[PDB]
């Protein structure tokens with residue numbers, strides 16, 4: 038069996054666990070050996086992961102960048118080693134990439150903003166918990182959210198990165214809460230930060246604040262169902278992973294593939 042490598046940004050996020058399971062199930066299906074490497078959100082670790090794979094007989098590299106701008110050196114090393122690179126979920130700003138597979142994060146952010154305006158009303162006072170700064174996913178969701186801010190005249194009280202992490206999202210929201218107790222709604226750029234934000238609101242006794250997450254992970258869907266999370270934009274991580282391995286197969290078989298493959302989003306609300 039030919040080996041396909043999957044370098045994922047982190048395995049400490051349910052979203053990336055499902056992405057890995059999607060790839061594993063498709064690799065099993067198509068008869069490939071799948072090696073999984075965790076970069077642990079560290080560009081230095083990511084680079085070393087890629088350097089080690091280029092000599093393991095890896096035929097194709099599926100990579101989820103820890104940083105869209107810094108991953109360029111790793112992609113270029115794969116390029117020198119003649120190993121095709123497919124990015125999943127986040128882009129690579131530099132280096133040659135065969136195909137990129139992800140959601141429309143600009144649309145995702147806009148839909149989140151529109152839903153908030155529908156519930157909390159136009160001109161609502163909002164806070165935004167942004168993802169890791171140098172990732173295409175976070176940059177795009179902020180951009181889509183900025184279109185909603187302008188359309189619905191939201192008053193953005195504060196906007197700060199909590200790095201797609203639940204504990205950080207918790208602490209950042211705790212601090213912004215003390216400084217802006219008049220917040221009406223919060224857009225968290227992933228479900229982990231949205232879950233952390235809910236816990237901060239719980240600790241602070243603020244039951245009145247509407248929170249919108251992003252991903253539709255098991256925990257995020259449970260919160261929406263329990264009525265704790267107002268909504269989440271569901272992604273299809275398992276299908277981003279499957280589409281990556283499927284696309285890896287086509288490349289290895291000499292079939293040309295599209296440069297971009299979108300994966301649908303869906304607004305998830307209770308009922």
Ligand SMILES: O[C@@H]1[C@H](O)[C@H](O)CO[C@H]1O
Nearest residue numbers: 052126127174201227252
């Ligand atoms: O799309 C993914 C998911 O939202 C994850 O939760 C954080 O990283 C983003 O790039």
